[PDB]
Amino acid sequence: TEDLKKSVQALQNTLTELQALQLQTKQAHWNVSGTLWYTLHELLQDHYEGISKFADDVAERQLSVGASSDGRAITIVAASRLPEIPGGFLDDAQVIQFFTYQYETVGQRIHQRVGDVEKVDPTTANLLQEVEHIIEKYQWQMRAFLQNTPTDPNTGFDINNGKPV
Amino acid sequence: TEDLKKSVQALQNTLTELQALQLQTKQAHWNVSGTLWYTLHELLQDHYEGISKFADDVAERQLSVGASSDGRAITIVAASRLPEIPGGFLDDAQVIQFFTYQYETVGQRIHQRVGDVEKVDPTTANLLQEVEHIIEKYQWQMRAFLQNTPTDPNTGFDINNGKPV
Amino acid sequence: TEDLKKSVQALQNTLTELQALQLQTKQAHWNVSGTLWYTLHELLQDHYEGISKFADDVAERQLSVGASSDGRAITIVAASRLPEIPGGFLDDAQVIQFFTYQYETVGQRIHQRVGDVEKVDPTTANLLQEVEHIIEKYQWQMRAFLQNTPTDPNTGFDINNGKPV
Amino acid sequence: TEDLKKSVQALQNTLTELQALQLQTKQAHWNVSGTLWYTLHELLQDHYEGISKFADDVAERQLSVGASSDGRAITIVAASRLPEIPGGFLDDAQVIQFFTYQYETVGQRIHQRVGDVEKVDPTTANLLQEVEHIIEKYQWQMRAFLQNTPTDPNTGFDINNGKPV
Amino acid sequence: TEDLKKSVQALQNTLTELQALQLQTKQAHWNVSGTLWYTLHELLQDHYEGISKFADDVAERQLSVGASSDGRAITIVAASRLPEIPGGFLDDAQVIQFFTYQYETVGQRIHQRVGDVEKVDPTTANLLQEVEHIIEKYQWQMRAFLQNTPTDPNTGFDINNGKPV
Amino acid sequence: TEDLKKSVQALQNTLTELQALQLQTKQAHWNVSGTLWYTLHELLQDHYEGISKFADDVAERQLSVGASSDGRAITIVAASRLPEIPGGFLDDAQVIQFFTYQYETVGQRIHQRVGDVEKVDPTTANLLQEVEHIIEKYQWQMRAFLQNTPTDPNTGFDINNGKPV
Amino acid sequence: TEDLKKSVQALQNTLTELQALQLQTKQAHWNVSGTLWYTLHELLQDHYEGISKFADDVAERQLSVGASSDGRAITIVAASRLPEIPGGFLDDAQVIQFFTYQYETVGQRIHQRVGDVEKVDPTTANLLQEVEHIIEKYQWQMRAFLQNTPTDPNTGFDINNGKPV
Amino acid sequence: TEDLKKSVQALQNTLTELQALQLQTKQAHWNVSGTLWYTLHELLQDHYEGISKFADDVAERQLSVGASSDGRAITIVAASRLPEIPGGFLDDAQVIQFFTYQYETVGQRIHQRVGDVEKVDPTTANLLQEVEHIIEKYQWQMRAFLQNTPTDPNTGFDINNGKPV
Amino acid sequence: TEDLKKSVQALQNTLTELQALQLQTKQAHWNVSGTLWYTLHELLQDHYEGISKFADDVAERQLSVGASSDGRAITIVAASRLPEIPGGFLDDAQVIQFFTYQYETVGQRIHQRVGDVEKVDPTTANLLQEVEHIIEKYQWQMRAFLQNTPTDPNTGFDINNGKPV
Amino acid sequence: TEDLKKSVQALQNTLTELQALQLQTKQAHWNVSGTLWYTLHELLQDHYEGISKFADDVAERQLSVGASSDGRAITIVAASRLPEIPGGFLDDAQVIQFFTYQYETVGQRIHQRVGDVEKVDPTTANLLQEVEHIIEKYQWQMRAFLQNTPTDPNTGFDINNGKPV
Amino acid sequence: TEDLKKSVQALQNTLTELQALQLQTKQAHWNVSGTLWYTLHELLQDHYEGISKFADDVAERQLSVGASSDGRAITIVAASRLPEIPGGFLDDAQVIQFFTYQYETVGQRIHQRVGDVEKVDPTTANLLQEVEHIIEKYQWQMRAFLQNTPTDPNTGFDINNGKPV
Amino acid sequence: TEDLKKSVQALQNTLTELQALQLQTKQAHWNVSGTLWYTLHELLQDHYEGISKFADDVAERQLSVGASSDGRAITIVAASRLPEIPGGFLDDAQVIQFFTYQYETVGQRIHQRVGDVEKVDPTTANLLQEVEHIIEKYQWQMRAFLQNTPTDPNTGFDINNGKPV
Ligand SMILES: [Cl-]
Ligand SMILES: [Cl-]
Ligand SMILES: [Cl-]
Ligand SMILES: [Cl-]
Ligand SMILES: [Cl-]
Ligand SMILES: [Cl-]
Ligand SMILES: [Cl-]
Ligand SMILES: [Cl-]
Ligand SMILES: [Cl-]
Ligand SMILES: [Cl-]
Ligand SMILES: [Cl-]
Ligand SMILES: [Cl-]
Ligand SMILES: [Fe+3]
Ligand SMILES: [Fe+3]
Ligand SMILES: [Fe+3]
Ligand SMILES: [Fe+3]
Ligand SMILES: [Fe+3]
Ligand SMILES: [Fe+3]
Ligand SMILES: [Fe+3]
Ligand SMILES: [Fe+3]
Ligand SMILES: [Fe+3]
Ligand SMILES: [Fe+3]
């Protein structure tokens, strides 16, 4: 059946994306610098925990429908399909920019996956909607730092050495 | 007796002000944007919980001296007597400005109320002093973002698109 | 897109209804009287906490799909579209009657909203199903006080001064 | 030895009675209606937890003296030897009446069992005294709703549509 | 000094009243019967804990200003100056009636005591205001069972065998 | 309406299956023997708690859409429609075999039920997807003991006296 | 039956003794002075909590076998039958002496009561054995301060102004 | 009196046996090896905690009836009267065999002791029944690994290098 | 205004005294010796925590009325105005003597301060009454070690090498 | 300085090894199969948490001595220098074999690193000793499954389809 | 011996530095102002707790090797040997600058002390390495606000009124 | 290798000493008498828990470097090499004297062991430094009861029947 194939594909692809996000949030947690370093250090820890919890649920849902889960380092690298986080000290505006985009792209892809599996496997779809919920919430939490308002454009000039982000 | 009338007036007026503050802190919690969005999101959650706890105490003190408590939406609107929080995305400096002022005006009014009821109802006065304590603490916590220091005026230029707040 | 418009409408309308319910449950929590006053005081506190939690989730889901959330007192009043709770001391049977109806009407409307947004935004639909779940559970918990049984009609005569409710 | 037979009989018969009580308390927890529905819903949850804990202790005491424990649905039905709880919506006075009687009859039987095994197996007797303690406490908690006092017969007329229970 | 005498008198008299209330709430906790027996059993436990906590604070405030505290059974009996709770099974309406009155009279007396010691010993006055706060809250919680409303007089006929309380 | 009939049928049938599973997991918890007795004793306790929690949710969802819930022993026996667990001491491989199958069949049936009620009652469907999620997870947890791998068939010979399971 | 009379007598007499002990331990908790004041203040708090817990169990066991419980102040005074604790500041050696004796006499009496009711009411006997257990443990904890050892008589001279206790 | 002698003997002999068991369970906790090493490591930790708790209760019951408790290493060695646990790495089947026997022999002896002291000291008998309860439960938990079933003899061949245990 | 000056003076002077007390209680916590060393080590830890909590409240009340708080080491030294605690190993009687006096003098001064600010700033007065409450409680807890009783002068001879304190 | 270079090298190399171990333990947690699947699932979760905690400490120690931390997926792959865990369903004996070896090799390398940095950076050495402690403990916990004993070689034949591991 | 002298010197000097840091972190906690006031208020509270915990460990290690600990205010002032924190309102950039430097200098000195005592007193050295660990971590946490990155120098211009820090 | 021999010797010898201390602290916990009996009862419980925790760590470190741990009663007796605690009732001064000495001698020996294994096994050395830390802290806590001060020799005359200890 390509109803098991559909399920596996959607779960496995989401798992890898969450694992990529685990590694990038931690990396940023450690290396972020600037005015918002501590704020972001704390926020990224919370995201990491939420992402880790859903990575474990997604992997065990995969096992639950009868397939092994591939969480290997090689598999994470092989699925790049997503900008990589710079090494070294990272700037607060750079971290914000980076996750605004990553969470948005990951959320979009999960959104597609929910549609794909919804009538063959509504239980897997339900799980993926929960993952999408958290990813899009995290997206807002990064986006909110640069959100345009009636009194202030929020260009990020102050967290970016005078320059818009 | 206008010793029950005094007590009711002081308690009821404080209740409505706290309920107005519940709604405005939550609104700001959701909609705040900019460099300090997350910081303020967390701080406003703490204030909301403190305000909610005292709203419940004030309402039940009113019941305790023998009068019903009016916590209706219509009553909150009817007591405006206090600037309203803008809708839409709100800027961090705008939120700070707004609560610096609201908490100050609410604290002042409670201060007056403590004097009013102190010898007819010292138990109600004691409660209102506790409310004033928390409101003025919250006032300092908003004020501290723009507090002038020997090395830095803290105009809020960085959180306000180059302009003093 | 009127897929963002659909989502915003469903989320915003639900938020206001939950906020209306926050205010009415608390009001009843304070002012309820009679044989079941304490029972209802405790039950209404539990409902208030459940409703408050989902109000926060609904507002932040709205932010998560890119729109501000309107939780203002004026907006609650403006959306009346729902009977208002009496002021003053409220009778236990009156509170029961009132929420049986409110929860039922709010649950119905959320039910409609779930259908409306389900294929444009299954993640928002999932959240609203969770809200509907709790609202309808609360509906049963109010309804159960007057539920007709094989041995007893449960007219509420005992909690209503000899008269059916 | 009919000292193991004695022990097994007393433990097994008590286990089945507790399991019958697990099912009836939950059933009543869900279906109770009327003025005391919520009160009883909460009280029956507490009883269910206490009963469940002792069912587990009784079953594992049976294993501890070297015999398997029969907790099957068929065995519960086979040991009826005890009125069955009506299906459908149940009235508060009906639930109270029902458990007043069930707890009393179960407590009596355990009381007999304590005497039976006390000198062959004082450790099993000790456990059964603890079960009897809780069952008789629960009996008082149901009985107390209809307990005659110097100022009021407590006929249950108010929770029974004008009629004594 | 009769500023220590004033303080001692106010503290000691309050201690005895709280201890009288400890004994009466527990007695009622055990012996209450009728429709509201369990409700009142739980409510009276909460009051007992609040009263016990303040009895300990009042006694240790007495020690703190340099005097021993008399918490003896003989002293409780000697200070009757307050209706005694009936023995035997007590009816729910009887318990409600009884504490409505006791809490009211105790609250009144503490209120007087606050005035008496307020300028010689504002710290003792502060403590007594906290005791008055809780006692009057408990008074409302008993009073609320019989509170007259626009739709229902709440005579207590249902919890009193057809007769107003 | 046969939209309430649909909902009731799906909820009621699931409730009975969960209650059957409550009884069988506990039975196995007590009576399991062999190399994996303690492992399974602990695992079956965890399943029992998860199953019990969802049984309570399913029963109260049934009440929430306006129908009583039938959790009686007779009803559990009447719905057999599912192999019964042996009495006496049960072998670890026998327990594993038994639940691998039970959880699989129960999960399948819930899966069908989700489809059945999904557009008349998406809130009930959502609940049943959560039940299916847990049941299928539990299925994997039993299946994993005998799961074929590249280095070892996992026949269960070691937990079955030399014989494949 | 004088098997209910036996049970009531044993339970009621124990309740009063525990309540007497509640009042005396608290009194000593507040008023104790000297080298061991703080030690004893803490120890007496622990005893008070243990005694309070068993007073509640004894009273509710009395209700459980169908009789009201008399916890009134007048009843405590009426059952003196036991030395009274001095008022005023109490010396550490005096407190130790006093409870060594009280706990011993109360433990003895409960011991007799266990024999009295053991075959009419083994469940009540079991409870009273638990009370005796704690009372005799508390007796050792007071006795241990003056316990004669091979290297030191422990006369209490140091806690008694040079004089043996 | 040889009623104190009886009590002391029963308590002291049980204490030493529990202390012997403390040392053997820990030893096995550390040194166990094989397929069931981790399972047994965890199970033996739980037993150790239960045994330690009762050792403390038994020793303090001894003090409570007026005698010192001998918990010395020399006394443990002197009371051997019980097979000693091998040193070095211990096999899972060896640990299981060993405690099946130890717990059984210790439980038997405590059982005798309960009879011995039951009418001179029912409070000490009650404590020893609680110790026997736990010891026999632990006995079942070890025995269950090798328990014969209708589908599998459970010889332990798999945990014993092909050989029955 | 010298109503802000009054408030600042009272708050600042209390802060410094509490900080002096933080340092002295810890110093004594570490260095106390003798019969009551451990008792006092524990008691002084509790006082330190209570004092630290109020130091933080006093400092933040100062900020709340618009002034900075001076908690510097130099400021603590500059406000000596209070005996200094000896260095080196400190004797139990010396610690008791020392805090009996310190707490008394600090409590007195706070008492004066409460009067000073009570009508310009009742909220600050309320806070200072809470500080006075704890300081005077701590005073009793030190005083109680040497408190004269009808049976024993409590000279402290035993904790002072034969000599009255 | 090549004292910062030394520190960075030792910390960075350890971080990557811990991150490799995070991924492999989770992978095994999900995919392990066979008799010991659940046991190992639980054990590997505990190891994962311990490893994750030290990965965070090692990365933040690196930041603490002034260097960024590289936790990227590419860096984990680039440092292979260590056998990779198979994908697909993994057998219990295979998991045990695999971590016995991995933990041993990682522990050895950390051991070397402790020597390397010990006198330039004893604080980093201290941290690495703590990491080595946990890694070697985990090594024993895997090794213990196959540990040779006087009564049983523990070849793993039972967990490996008749064949030694 | 000047091995006790060495130990005392290293411990005592570290204690004073930690106590200086306790006072400065709290001072900054209260008085910090500007964009990062709340962030720093929270961060400085965490540091204060970590510093307080190690101050207590260092003082009690000093006692453990047989010397008293000097924690007096005079001793803190006497050891200045370290810039003092300004009084009045302090700017966020000023606080960051100040602790970046203080933590660095304190960490350096502890580092030296670890070398000094390492072979006379490795247990004291171990403790001091733990103190150094936390101090240097806190140093990074302050330093990270101004850490230069590839996209942004992080001069602190935004938190310093346009000027580099 | 005699680097494993060194490690084993140091770990095994420490384990036995900690186990000896477990037994002696408990023995003293039970049997201590006199003025400081309760104080010491509590203090010795805390030491016992700290000692037990490190005994478990030391034994599992031994396993971690590849050797079994000998925790047998016979081995404890065989390693006497340390005064034995008297049986019977023990005097407070005797307990203090005894542990002052035991902890000192055990701490000394561990100190030697740290030197012995430090460069072959720094991870084992680190663990032993932690054990030494706690043992020497416990030594101070016993020593502090008799510590000579400028105002009082602390001979223990008061806790020793007039005689210096
Ligand atoms: Cl899980
Ligand atoms: Cl409340
Ligand atoms: Cl949240
Ligand atoms: Cl259990
Ligand atoms: Cl307290
Ligand atoms: Cl619930
Ligand atoms: Cl209870
Ligand atoms: Cl205890
Ligand atoms: Cl705070
Ligand atoms: Cl952290
Ligand atoms: Cl500590
Ligand atoms: Cl562990
Ligand atoms: Fe967090
Ligand atoms: Fe998992
Ligand atoms: Fe999960
Ligand atoms: Fe930046
Ligand atoms: Fe918060
Ligand atoms: Fe409330
Ligand atoms: Fe409250
Ligand atoms: Fe802004
Ligand atoms: Fe609640
Ligand atoms: Fe929120």
Ligand SMILES: [Fe+3]
């Ligand atoms: Fe939420």
Ligand SMILES: [Fe+3]
């Ligand atoms: Fe959901």
Ligand SMILES: [Fe+3]
């Ligand atoms: Fe009514």
Ligand SMILES: [Fe+3]
């Ligand atoms: Fe409950």
Ligand SMILES: [Fe+3]
């Ligand atoms: Fe169980």
Ligand SMILES: [Fe+3]
């Ligand atoms: Fe249990």
Ligand SMILES: [Fe+3]
């Ligand atoms: Fe009814």
Ligand SMILES: [Fe+3]
């Ligand atoms: Fe309660």
Ligand SMILES: [Fe+3]
């Ligand atoms: Fe107290």
Ligand SMILES: [Fe+3]
């Ligand atoms: Fe208190």
Ligand SMILES: [Fe+3]
């Ligand atoms: Fe009634």
Ligand SMILES: [Fe+3]
């Ligand atoms: Fe569990």
Ligand SMILES: [Fe+3]
């Ligand atoms: Fe439920």
Ligand SMILES: [Fe+3]
């Ligand atoms: Fe639930």
Ligand SMILES: [Fe+3]
């Ligand atoms: Fe088997």
Ligand SMILES: [Fe+3]
């Ligand atoms: Fe306590």
